[PDB]
């Protein structure tokens, strides 16, 4: 009489996995054998990635850049000598690092105005109140309000090669295409309408610490302001104190010649950005990218350790049972 359906009687059709030895050991062995190969292909792809990082902060009495470690005539100019022992093959990526720089600070991440950087004419002429101490000055609204947009990395790094002569061959760096495609073509637009970009930014100012307005960050209108890729790239927060942000990308030359031949190079810095205060470092990193990113051994060593601990357990188990 009681409703004798599959569900009310707690006898639905089910699977009920049976977990028995011959159903539980080949697991350890399969993951061991699938990981160690992966954790070796990865380890090798990593170790085959050539990178070099030059810490050009100064602070070392003998360093070339200690002449602008202190607050000096605004346009310092130092240069550091590095040497590429083993040439760089693919297309290369130049980053810039920063230590003890908390771009991931609650007060610092809050400090943007997305409605304004997204071209909303209403929020252009009255920035939000999250970008607070840098929201108005000189009785006007700041164009890229906030801390994030104000403390934007602003020193120019350049690379030179030293040929069979001593003359410097100027390596050619490229600025376009270093920021997420979306958040340069969608999430960051310029104020709505107009022909010249200094008209749109009409009732606004330039942030406190900057030196030129936003509408004078670059000459090609496709990289000018709110769309400047270096701006967009600084604005994506670091997530850890020691971070690094893509600065330039050197594209492999269609010839059969490496991008960065071995030899001696100058890295000359127009040292602008001060990090001596909060005890930070500034580094320039030249690296080559693989199918997996950059040189980082964690993935390889971790896959290998997991696939050689699973296999050790699988062997201990096969021993225990099939011997017992």
């Amino acid at each position: 009489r009681p409703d004798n359906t599959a569900f009310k009687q707690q006898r639905l059709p089910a699977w009920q996995p049976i977990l028995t030895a011959g159903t539980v050991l080949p697991i350890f062995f399969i993951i061991g054998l699938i990981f160690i190969p992966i954790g070796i292909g990865i380890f090798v792809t990593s170790n085959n990635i050539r990178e070099i990082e030059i810490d050009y902060t100064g602070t070392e009495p003998s360093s070339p850049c200690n002449k602008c470690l202190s607050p000096d005539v605004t346009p310092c100019f130092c240069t550091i000598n590095f040497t590429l022992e083993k040439s760089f093959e693919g297309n290369v990526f130049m980053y810039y690092g920063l230590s003890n720089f908390y771009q991931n600070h609650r007060r610092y991440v809050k400090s943007r105005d997305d409605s304004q950087l997204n071209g909303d004419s209403s929020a252009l002429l009255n920035p939000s109140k999250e970008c607070e101490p840098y929201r108005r000055n000189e009785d006007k609204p700041i164009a890229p309000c906030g801390a994030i947009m104000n403390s934007m990395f602003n020193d120019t790094l350049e690379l030179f090669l030293i040929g069979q002569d001593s003359y410097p061959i100027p390596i050619a760096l490229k600025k376009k295409g270093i920021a997420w495609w979306t958040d340069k073509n969608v999430k960051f637009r310029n104020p709505p309408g107009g022909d010249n970009l200094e008209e749109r930014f009409k009732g606004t100012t330039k942030p406190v610490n900057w030196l030129k307005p936003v509408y004078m960050l670059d000459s090609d209108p496709d990289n000018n302001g709110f769309i400047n890729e270096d701006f967009i790239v600084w604005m994506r927060t670091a997530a850890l104190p020691t971070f690094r942000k893509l600065y330039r990308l050197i594209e492999r030359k269609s010839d059969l010649h490496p991008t960065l031949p071995a030899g001696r190079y100058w890295l000359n810095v127009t040292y602008n950005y001060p990090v001596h205060y909060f005890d930070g470092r500034k580094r320039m990193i030249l690296s080559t990218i693989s199918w997996m990113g950059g040189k980082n051994p964690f993935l390889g060593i971790a896959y290998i350790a997991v696939g050689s601990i699973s296999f050790l357990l699988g062997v201990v188990l096969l021993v225990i049972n099939h011997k017992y």
Binding site: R1, P2, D3, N4, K8, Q9, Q10, L12, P13, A14, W15, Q16, P17, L19, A21, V24, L25, I27, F93, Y95, Y102, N104, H105, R106, R107, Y108, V109, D114, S128, E132, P133, A147, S151, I178, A179, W180, T182, K187, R236, T237, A239, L240, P241, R244, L246, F278, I285, S287, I289, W291, M292, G293, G294, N296, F298, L299, A302, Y303, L313, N321
Partner: protein
Amino acid sequence: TRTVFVGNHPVQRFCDNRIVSSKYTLWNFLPKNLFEQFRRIANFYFLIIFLVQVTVDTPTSPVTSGLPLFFVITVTAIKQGYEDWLRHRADNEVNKSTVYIIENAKRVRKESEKIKVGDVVEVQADETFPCDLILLSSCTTDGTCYVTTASLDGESNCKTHYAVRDTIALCTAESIDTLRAAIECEQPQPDLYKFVGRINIYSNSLEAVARSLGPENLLLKGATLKNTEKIYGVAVYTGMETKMALNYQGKSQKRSAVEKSINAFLIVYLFILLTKAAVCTTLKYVWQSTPYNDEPWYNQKTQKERETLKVLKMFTDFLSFMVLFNFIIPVSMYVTVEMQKFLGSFFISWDKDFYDEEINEGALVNTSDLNEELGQVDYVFTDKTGTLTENSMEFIECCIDGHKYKVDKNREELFLRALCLCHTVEIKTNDAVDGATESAELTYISSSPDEIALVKGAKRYGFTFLGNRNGYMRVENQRKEIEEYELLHTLNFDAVRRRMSVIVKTQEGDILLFCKGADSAVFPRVQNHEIELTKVHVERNAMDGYRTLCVAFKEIAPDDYERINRQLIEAKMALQDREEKMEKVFDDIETNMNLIGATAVEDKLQDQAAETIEALHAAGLKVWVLTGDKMETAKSTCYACRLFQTNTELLELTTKTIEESERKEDRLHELLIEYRKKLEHQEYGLIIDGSTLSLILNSSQDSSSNNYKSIFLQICMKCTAVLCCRMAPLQKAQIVRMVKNLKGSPITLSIGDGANDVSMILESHVGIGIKGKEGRQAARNSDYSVPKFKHLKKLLLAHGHLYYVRIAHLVQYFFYKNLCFILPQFLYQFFCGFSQQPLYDAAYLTMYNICFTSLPILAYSLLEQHINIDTLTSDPRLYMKISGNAMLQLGPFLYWTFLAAFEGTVFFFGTYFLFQTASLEENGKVYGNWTFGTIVFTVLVFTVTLKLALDTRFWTWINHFVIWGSLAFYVFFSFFWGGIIWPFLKQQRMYFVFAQMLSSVSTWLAIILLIFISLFPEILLIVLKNVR
């Protein structure tokens, strides 16, 4: 003591006939539901958090704490508000049905809500009773009506109720003729079976002929009237006072030990939350010490924020850390553990293995809160006759004057008359076609199957009872001589006294008091010379497993009978404690009665009443049998059931070895402290009595160098077999009380089928009522009700086991998943200026509990069998002994907490080590801190979902659905929220974080590896258990 006047005409203080079974109203639903929700440790906590978020400035938006709460609160409010609109609807249907009233020679048709105490209601046939009536008349003579309380207490037999004699002359015409009455009745009690009253019918000149009422007249409210013409009643209780409406209070037992572990876990997670917040503030101010760790020139405070008092900042930062780590406490645990108990209360009444083909009923779940207290039971207290042995009494071997009649013509006749009288059999009036049976249909329909058996056993010989002809009693005395009798008084039976009696008047002469009772309660008052002769047959019959009743009689004289007349009618005409004032009267009416003989009745065990006590002794329980029957009858039934095995040394504390106030203690201590602690399951079993248990408990207030009750409980706990004979209905509860206290909380169960067992079924943790031959009196005081003993095996073993496992692994996992959530966000505070910056986005913070992880565990807690429900009952040997609350102890709790700590550490510090890369793409683009949080959240969501997918051993299509669909909804919501969710937002912070995080083979491999490293300490236990 209320005094109603029949027609409401003289010779207001009273309620109105409107029942309200609901709780709320249309105007105090919120004010009354919210207050009762927000009174719970976690609802109040999240309301506090929401208010601290709305007043202060905090890390996490106010929506993330008040959207997950406005939902968990509005879901329970909808559930309870509907589950009460049902009660409103039902009350309306009940008390908005027409009911005719004889106002003044006028048959008005009011509504049942407009009836007032003391007005002649007129009920037609098949029409339920509008209120507690008092049947003042009927159409047919004989003044009787058939009522069937098919709804009040579940029963389905047509009980018969009696009118008031002086009133049956009133029928449909001028019954409103100022029938002067004064129905003095006791104050409303929910007893549902007792009633104390008195009438004062007045004549034209002077009369006070008051017929003392009882439960024989009161036609309860809501008890259908069957197979009659029409009745007139004088409402006495008028709704919200009538028992049917006073029995709405039946909740206060449902409190399990898995509702206090939820609170211990909540307290621990609160003191984990406070330690997280306090550590993070202590270290936020040992970090900000350095002048450049606050406002270092790239982020600089605001004037206001800079010139704020300091201590105020320490307080506000502690608050912001409690409001950041505030999710370590589950928001959706309450609504899920309530929807689970709701939707899963049914499985234990939908079951077709609790379905008795005879009773044509199944099981019945009167409290869906102990559901998980069945899988925890530690003791089981049973009743012998009715549960272990169904009341199919077969009369065998009467014994007249110690002769074993099978005495020539002197007293056998008297013995057979005794058997035929001194009962309340009440043959079914109408008889079917006669000729296919032995005598006729003559279906003896009594309430006590011990009387039916005796009448059938007298019929085996000459006598044949056929009477009850409106005040008379007829019997064929071995010759077709009807031989009318006359029932003058029926000294009914009560479990405590153990004697039923009757005072008949011979057809042509004197009076005779017949008395049938137990031997213990009938030998004390007899002519002692015959005890020594009949007790040997009583003892044989007992030792062979038969129920023995002694039959005695007394010749009453006129003047002595005229004295007993007053002594007995003044006991019923008295409104104050008439049951007691009447026990004390017909307890001296039965003083020195000439013992006639004894009668033995054989009874059989139920279907599987031995293979169930074996299945209960196997699963660890300790089955005690608290009976009221004799000591050798109970002992024989216990040996049959396999309670006592063949090679068991029995410890008898009965009256056969303890006839001395001090000689009891001798054994009491000798066979415990020098015997059963110095010296098994099959070897030791105890056998106590009622008088001896009284001696132990009651007057053990004098000798306490070695406490009596203490030494005795010590004797008991070393025995898994105990048989408490001759136990009364209140000692049956004294025993459960004694046990509920010792050495912890032994979770007791108590299973009974009679009116004696209505006391322990109420005392013990979870009570089970059987629905058998006696009535449905216990089945309605009980928490569960099964129509058989053998159903206790399935109930405990295969329903408590699953009901307990499902909720213990819902409770453990609800805290696991949240410690896993929140440990990455606590560890991120170091790799942050301790600035309380949320690791995860806001949509993620709200959704995790109410969307991404809510269903899988609910579907698991409903449809899941970690041991197939067939092997569960096939094997009690352990499968039940395995979880004596063990699944929610410290051991498992800390295993789960350490697994969640390990997994949170792995999530965070695997993404941390992966983000040392300079790029995770192949175009060399860098990932922010929103792509760090979505990586940690992806790993978290998948690891918790797959830790549950590794736990399910029973994969219904619904498990497949909820698990893989929770994962696919995380993955579809994250893409949908990445894309356009713009206009109403102030952030655009996660605009493509997911769709870019997933464009990196390196993040794919990292997510796979971290899910695996996090599930390893579990795939390892799986294997270590599959092996060895």
